[PDB]
Backbone as a printed PyTorch tensor [residue, N CA C, xyz], in Angstrom:
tensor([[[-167.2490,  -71.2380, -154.2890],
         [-166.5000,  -72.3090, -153.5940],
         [-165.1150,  -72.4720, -154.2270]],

        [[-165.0900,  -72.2950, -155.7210],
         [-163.5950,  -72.6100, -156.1320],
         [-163.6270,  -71.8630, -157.8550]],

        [[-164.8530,  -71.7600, -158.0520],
         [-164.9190,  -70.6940, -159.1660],
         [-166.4970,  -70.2830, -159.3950]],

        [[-166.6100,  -69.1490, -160.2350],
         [-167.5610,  -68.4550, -160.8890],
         [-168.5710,  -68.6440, -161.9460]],

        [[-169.6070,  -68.8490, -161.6670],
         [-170.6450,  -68.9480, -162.6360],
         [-170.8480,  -67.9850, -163.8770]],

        [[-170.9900,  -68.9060, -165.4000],
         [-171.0820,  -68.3530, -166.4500],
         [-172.0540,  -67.0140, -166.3560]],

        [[-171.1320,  -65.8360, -165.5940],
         [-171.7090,  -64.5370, -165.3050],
         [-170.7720,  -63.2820, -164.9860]],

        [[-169.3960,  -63.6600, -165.3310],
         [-168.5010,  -62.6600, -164.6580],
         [-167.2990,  -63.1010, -165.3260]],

        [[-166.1980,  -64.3320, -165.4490],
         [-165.2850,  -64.9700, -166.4330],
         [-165.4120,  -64.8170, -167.4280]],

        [[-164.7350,  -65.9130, -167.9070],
         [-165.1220,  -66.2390, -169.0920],
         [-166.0100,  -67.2940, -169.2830]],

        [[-167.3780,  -67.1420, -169.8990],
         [-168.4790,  -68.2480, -169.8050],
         [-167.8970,  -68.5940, -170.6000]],

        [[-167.1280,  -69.7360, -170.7770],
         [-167.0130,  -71.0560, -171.7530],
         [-166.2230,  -72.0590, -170.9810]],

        [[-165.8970,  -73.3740, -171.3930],
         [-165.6520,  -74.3030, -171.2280],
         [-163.8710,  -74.3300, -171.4780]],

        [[-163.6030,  -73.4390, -170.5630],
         [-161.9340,  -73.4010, -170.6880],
         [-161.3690,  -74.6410, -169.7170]],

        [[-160.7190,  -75.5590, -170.5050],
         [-160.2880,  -76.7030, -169.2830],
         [-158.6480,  -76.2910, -168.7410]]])
């Protein structure tokens, strides 16, 4: 919808 699940990014908590 507007981003990617901790599975493909970067999994962390980038604000």
């Amino acid at each position: 919808p507007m981003t990617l699940p901790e599975n493909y990014f970067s999994e962390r908590p980038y604000h």
